[PDB]
Structure formats: structure tokens, C-alpha cells
Ligand binder design. Structure first.
Ligand SMILES: Nc1ncnc2c1ncn2[C@@H]1O[C@H](C(=O)N2CCN(CC(=O)Nc3cccc4c3CNC4=O)CC2)[C@@H](O)[C@H]1O
Ligand SMILES: [Zn+2]
Ligand SMILES: [Zn+2]
Lengths: 469, 223
DNA sequence: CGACG
DNA sequence: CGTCG
């Protein structure tokens, strides 16, 4: 682990690792009513060279200068270990090596800080695609980059993030059924203990604003899927190794191919600059076939109203996606903002789905899938409704929006409807959605067919110079 | 909670933040609660009752602005209230009557407290609290205060939610229990449920040193 | 939070 | 412990 720099021994000494234990505790303590949001760091340091041992304490209020520290050099490592363990006991009420930890009132809670041939035959576009979806650089950066506003006490392990996620789901369940305020306060204290925040010196707020808790759940879901993608990158020409890991077959559609021209028209007509400060440019087209996905999709192949629809996610996930097909969220995850419960979402307009790539001006490249989804009988809704059961005779859901592709321009590719028409007004009244949202609830109702690489040409100084002369 | 505090020195060890001299024990002292730079908590800067009003601290209404005011002795309350500054008449007679009752209750509690201090020891008071199903708090001052409370009004029954121990603050009774290991109880009430105080027979020789006089008094709170 | 009677 | 910073 890391030596706390406040001690001034990071280059002179390291942190001790005896047996199956590391001597660096980072404890938090939160009380919303009284307003306390305290941190306590404890470390046992060993000099890299000689046999000299230190105990370092650092207490205070998170994300502020309030606090202090102390450093005691000890006569021996035995006395140092005794001191460390007894201090941990005094501050948390539990022993150092205790499988089952139990929170005690007015005591700190321990946080789980995360510390630390060349005969590639494949075509160049596919090699670049693989380099894109397996970029350890970007993932390691986004993961272990030191942010003190979102992580005032350091990176949190996947365990603790999942714990806060489940606590947020419990909060939503409590807010749904008018539960006691005591329930909500207990959950809030637990959450803010597990997920330290830099509130300066203001009292932490209760988890009563469902919008803010949806935001926090989205943040935690982002962190969790990042952790999953990184766990995927480490498995064991390297490009061909990762290609094998995908468990999918990829082919580069020819530029002057006619299905490629159909795909390009689809991207062109259905991109609305009304809520997208950028234009889409197609770089590469890819035809994809997943391991045995056609098998699980056969039951719906002859189903009616099959449609080729968009799905956009962050590139970090795409690896995962291609190796497991689109997956539904678990039943214990809180809602992040989606309007029609837990399922596989798609859009008919590339704008809507592309905005889910979260591509920035620094990395204007984003990935996006085309899937033949077997929609069958639609359940057409205008307002949110967390559907757990589809009405009898229905195979999918469709949230109707104010703008839709022109239905008179539908195309039939492989017997599949493609809504590549231009944007028009739908005629639906009293609708909260702007663009349609198709939704299925059986992972087998979707058959991924094409994968696109898109440049998000943002309308900045460069675009303005290129567009005005 | 409050910005100001007043009490009798629980020890002759605190130094005045103005004259930098030791505040003697049991002496009326006033503190201003400020943020500590050393840890995440509020700390009182203490002052002699004399040196306090020399730092230009304008206190309009001590009983409400200052914590622990209602617990002081009556004459010291009057002193703090005065120094802080430097159909209506029937209701005024009524107000005078209520003030007389309040003085009665205050000096009664204090007489009981110092009588117990004269006869009983600290462990005797702890035992008196135990026998009445009361929690033994930290600080012999609080021990004596709670023994007096119990003897006057009655042994406080446990809380109904957390099953903790209720304690009297300047305002009303607050629960000090823990609904869970993460949050404390916050039950507040001025009418706590209680059974009659029962002095163990051991202290009967000293309970006649209380001359009974239990009275049927009820805790009077400020408006 | 740690320090001291 | 109980008080104090
Ligand atoms: N195997 C896998 N490995 C990694 N990530 C995987 C995966 N399978 C699914 N995912 C990814 O997890 C994410 C997920 O579950 N989510 C995201 C949150 N929620 C809302 C949602 O559907 N958003 C949403 C809403 C409306 C339209 C569109 C989308 C996304 N694309 C669209 O066209 C649906 C559940 C999602 O981004 C998906 O692509
Ligand atoms: Zn003084
Ligand atoms: Zn209670």
C-alpha cells in the first residue's frame, strides 16, 4: 500500500505486510444529525534499509485541513504491532484480524481502500478496433487517478462500492413505501460512511431527494462496470489473444458495399443536431457474430416486427458486451434513471443512442452497436412505468417520443425493418420522451449484427473554421 | 447546538482564554463553543464570569442563547441574567407565581443535591441509580444531578423505541440510546414515563436524612 | 481526535 | 475514567 505523505517517510520507508495482513487502516465515522464526518488513518511503517519501525496516526475531518497527525518510532516491531492493534481496537471496537466485523455505536468503520511473434494477420481496421476496446492505459488512468472530491480518502474497492449500491437500492425501497425517517437516516449514515464525501464543513444531507440518489446510483454503476471491464482485461500476437477472448467473429464491411451505404444513410438521416453539439462520421463498419447467439436467437427469428436498432455504451464496456451479449441489470440494483424498468434498451435514432457513449472532445471516437431485436407485439407507453410483467400477448415495450424516423422510408434488410427515414413529428400528445425507446426483457430477443466506429466531430473552433470560408 | 455555555467548573484545571489563569473548581464559568483545528469537534473556550463580559459578547437572552442555564442555581441565574444587560397585570401576577414556583423547584433540587453530597459518596449515588434501573453517567456532577431528578420526580423508565436511557437537558428530556450501531435515538419529550423512586433500605438511616418530603411535584419547563 | 490529572 | 484543547 501507500505510505501517508503526511509522515514524511514515503521515500525512506514502506508500509508493513506481515503474513496475510497489511498495516494501513483508513476508517470513517459519520453522523448526519450532529454533522460529524471524520477520518482516521493508521499505518505501521518499516524503514527500507535498517530495522526501524514507526506508528503513524492521522485524524481529522474529511476533505478539510481540520485535523492533525502523530508519528512515534517504536523500540521494536513487536511493540509496534501491539500498539497498532490496540489503537485499531480502541477506535473501531473490533480486532485487527476478524472475519466478521460488527459496527459499534460511536466507533469508526474500516474502509476498504484499493491499492495498486508479431504475426497478427487480422485486417488493419479490426486491429485498430481491438486496440480501442482493450486499452489498458485509459482504464488504469480513469481507475487509479487521484481525485480528492469523489474519493477524499482514496480509491474504494469493488466490494465497498457494491455495498453502497445495495444501500442506495434499500433507500429507494424505503422512499417508495413512506418508510420511517429513522430507516432513511440509518441508511444515509451507512452510505456516507462507505462513500466518503468532501462536504467541507457542512452537514451531510439526507438521501431523500430521489433525483440526487439516482445520480449517485449512476455514478456507482459507472465505477462498478469500470471495475468489471478491468477485471476482464486481465485474463491470460496479443491482438489475436484478445480477439479470441471476445468469443465473436468480426468482419470489415466494404465501404462501397450496398449494405454499408444503407447503414450510412441510417446514421445520416437519424442524427438530430437539436440536442447533439456534434456531427457523426462513420469510420469503419463491422459485421459481428457472437458465440452461439444465433442459437439462442432462433426462437424469435420467425417472430414478427424484427427491427435493426441502435445501442450505445462507453467503449470500456464493449469488450464485455461482445463476450457475453447484451445483459440486463440484476434485480438488486437501484434505478439509475431509466423509465421502463430493467431490460435491454435500444433507440431508432442514432442521436439518442450515441449520447450514451459519453464521448468527449479529447476522444471523439465512440462505438455503437446495431442489433436485430425481435420486438413482436409492442407495449406502447407515453410515461414512465417500471414494468416487471409484460401484458399477455406482448413481447417488448416502446416508449413513444415527439420525434421519430419517417415510417414511409422503412427498408427491409434480411426481412428486418430498418427505420432509416428522416426525423419527423410523431403526432403523439402528452409524451415526456423526445426519442423513441425500444425495450426487451429477454437477453435472447436481441441478435447483434453490426458494430460501428464513429467520430464525433464537435462544433468547435476547428469545425467553425472548416465550415466558414 | 448552542453557541454559548455556562456551568460550575467541573475541575479547577481550565485556564481562562482571557486572563490565562486557572478557573477554580465549582466556580461559575462561561464558555464560547468554537471549532477545534485539531479534530472534528467543537470545544469550549472558557472564561471567568468576570472576564467573559469584557470580550464584548452581547447576549440578549441567556436562558435561550446559553446552554446549561436552567441547571444553574437561582441566584446565579439572576446574576447571569442581569449582567447580560450590563389584563396584562393579572397575567403578570400569574407570571410572578410561576417564577416563585420555578425558584422553589430550583433551590429544592440544589438542596437535595448538596445534602446527598454531604451524606452519600459517589458509589452510594451510583448504587441509588442502579437500584432504580437508571444508567450511571460519566461525571459525578451528572451522577448527582440524575439522582436528584429521580428522587424528585421518579425513576425514568427506558425509552420505548431504542430501549435506552432518557436524560434531562435544558429544554426537555432527550434519549441517549442507539436505535442502531450507526445512528442514535432522537426521541424528545417533556412527559417521560417513570415509576416511583425507591431508596434501598440500606440508606433508610440517610433517607430519614431526607425527611421524606417527596412532594407530588412535576418538572416545570420554560415556555 | 490526543493529552494529562 | 473524566476533564480539557
Ligand atoms: N457484458 C457486459 N459487459 C459490460 N457492460 C455490459 C454488458 N452487458 C451490458 N452492459 C452495459 O451495462 C449497462 C447497463 O446494464 N445498463 C445501463 C443503464 N440502463 C439504462 C439504459 O438502458 N440506457 C438507455 C436508455 C435509452 C436508450 C439507450 C440506452 C442505452 N442505449 C440506448 O440506445 C440500462 C442498464 C449498459 O451500458 C449496457 O450496455
Ligand atoms: Zn479570566
Ligand atoms: Zn430512544
Amino acid at each position: 500500500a501507500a505510505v501517508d505523505p503526511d509522515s514524511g517517510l514515503e521515500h525512506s520507508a514502506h508500509v508493513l505486510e506481515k503474513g496475510g495482513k497489511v498495516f494501513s487502516a483508513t476508517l470513517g465515522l459519520v453522523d448526519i444529525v450532529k454533522g460529524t464526518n471524520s477520518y482516521y488513518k493508521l499505518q505501521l511503517l518499516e524503514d527500507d534499509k535498517e530495522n526501524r519501525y514507526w506508528i503513524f496516526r492521522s485524524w481529522g475531518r474529511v476533505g478539510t485541513v481540520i485535523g492533525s497527525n502523530k508519528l512515534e518510532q517504536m523500540p521494536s516491531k513487536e511493540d509496534a504491532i501491539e500498539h497498532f492493534m490496540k489503537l485499531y481496537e480502541e477506535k473501531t471496537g473490533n480486532a485487527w484480524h476478524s472475519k466478521n466485523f460488527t459496527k459499534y455505536p460511536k466507533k469508526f468503520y474500516p474502509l476498504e481502500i484499493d491499492y495498486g511473434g508479431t504475426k497478427s494477420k487480422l485486417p488493419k481496421p479490426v486491429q485498430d478496433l481491438i486496440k480501442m476496446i482493450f486499452d489498458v492505459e485509459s482504464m488504469k488512468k480513469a481507475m487509479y487517478e487521484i481525485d480528492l472530491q469523489k474519493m477524499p480518502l482514496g480509491k474504494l474497492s469493488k466490494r465497498q462500492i457494491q455495498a453502497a449500491y445495495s444501500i442506495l437500492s434499500e433507500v429507494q425501497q424505503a422512499v417508495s413505501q413512506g418508510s420511517s425517517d429513522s430507516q432513511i437516516l440509518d441508511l444515509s449514515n451507512r452510505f456516507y460512511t462507505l462513500i466518503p464525501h468532501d462536504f467541507g464543513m457542512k452537514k451531510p444531507p439526507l438521501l431523500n431527494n430521489a433525483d440526487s440518489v439516482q445520480a449517485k446510483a449512476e455514478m456507482l454503476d459507472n465505477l462498478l462496470d469500470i471495475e468489471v471491464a478491468y477485471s476482464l482485461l486481465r485474463g491470460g500476437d496479443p491482438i489475436d489473444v484478445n480477439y479470441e477472448k471476445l468469443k465473436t467473429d468480426i468482419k470489415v464491411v466494404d465501404r462501397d458495399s450496398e449494405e454499408a451505404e444503407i447503414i450510412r444513410k441510417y446514421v445520416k438521416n437519424t442524427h438530430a443536431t437539436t440536442h447533439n453539439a456534434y456531427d457523426l462520421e462513420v469510420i469503419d463498419i463491422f459485421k459481428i457474430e457472437r458465440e452461439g447467439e444465433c442459437q439462442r436467437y432462433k426462437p424469435f427469428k420467425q417472430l414478427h416486427n424484427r427491427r435493426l436498432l441502435w445501442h450505445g455504451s462507453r467503449t470500456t464496456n464493449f469488450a464485455g458486451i461482445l463476450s457475453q451479449g447484451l445483459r440486463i441489470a440484476p434485480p438488486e440494483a437501484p434505478v439509475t434513471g431509466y423509465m421502463f424498468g430493467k431490460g435491454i434498451y435500444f433507440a431508432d435514432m442514432v442521436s439518442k443512442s450515441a449520447n450514451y457513449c459519453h464521448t468527449s472532445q479529447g476522444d471523439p471516437i465512440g462505438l455503437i452497436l446495431l442489433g436485430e431485436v425481435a420486438l413482436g407485439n409492442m407495449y406502447e407507453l407515453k410515461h414512465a412505468s417500471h414494468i416487471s410483467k409484460l401484458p399477455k400477448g406482448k413481447h417488448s415495450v416502446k416508449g413513444l417520443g415527439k420525434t421519430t424516423p419517417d415510417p414511409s422510408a422503412n427498408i427491409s434488410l434480411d426481412g428486418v425493418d430498418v427505420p432509416l427515414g428522416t426525423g419527423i413529428s410523431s403526432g403523439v400528445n402528452d409524451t415526456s420522451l423526445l426519442y423513441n425507446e425500444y425495450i426487451v426483457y429477454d437477453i435472447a430477443q436481441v441478435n447483434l449484427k453490426y458494430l460501428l466506429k464513429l467520430k464525433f466531430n464537435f462544433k468547435t473552433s476547428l469545425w467553425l473554421e472548416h465550415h466558414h470560408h | 447546538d448552542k453557541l454559548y455555555r455556562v456551568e460550575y467548573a467541573k475541575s479547577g484545571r481550565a485556564s481562562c482564554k482571557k486572563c490565562s489563569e486557572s478557573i477554580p473548581k465549582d466556580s461559575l464559568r462561561m464558555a464560547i463553543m468554537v471549532q477545534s483545528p485539531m479534530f472534528d469537534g467543537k470545544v469550549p473556550h472558557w472564561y471567568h464570569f468576570s472576564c467573559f463580559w469584557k470580550v464584548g459578547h452581547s447576549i440578549r437572552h441567556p436562558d435561550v442563547e446559553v446552554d446549561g442555564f436552567s441547571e444553574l442555581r437561582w441566584d446565579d441565574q439572576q446574576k447571569v441574567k442581569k449582567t447580560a444587560e450590563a389584563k396584562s397585570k393579572k397575567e403578570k401576577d400569574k407570571d410572578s407565581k410561576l417564577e416563585k414556583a420555578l425558584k422553589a423547584q430550583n433551590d429544592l433540587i440544589w438542596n437535595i443535591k448538596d445534602e446527598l453530597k454531604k451524606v452519600c459518596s459517589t458509589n452510594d449515588l451510583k448504587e441509588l441509580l442502579i437500584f432504580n434501573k437508571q444508567q450511571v453517567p460519566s461525571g459525578e456532577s451528572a451522577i448527582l444531578d440524575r439522582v436528584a431528578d429521580g428522587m424528585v420526580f421518579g425513576a425514568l423508565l427506558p425509552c420505548e423505541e431504542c430501549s435506552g436511557q432518557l436524560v434531562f437537558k435544558s429544554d426537555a428530556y432527550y434519549c441517549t440510546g442507539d436505535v442502531t450501531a450507526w445512528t442514535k435515538c432522537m426521541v424528545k419529550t417533556q412527559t417521560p414515563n417513570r415509576k416511583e423512586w425507591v431508596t434501598p433500605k440500606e440508606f433508610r438511616e440517610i433517607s430519614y436524612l431526607k425527611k421524606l418530603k417527596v412532594k407530588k411535584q412535576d418538572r416545570i419547563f420554560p415556555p
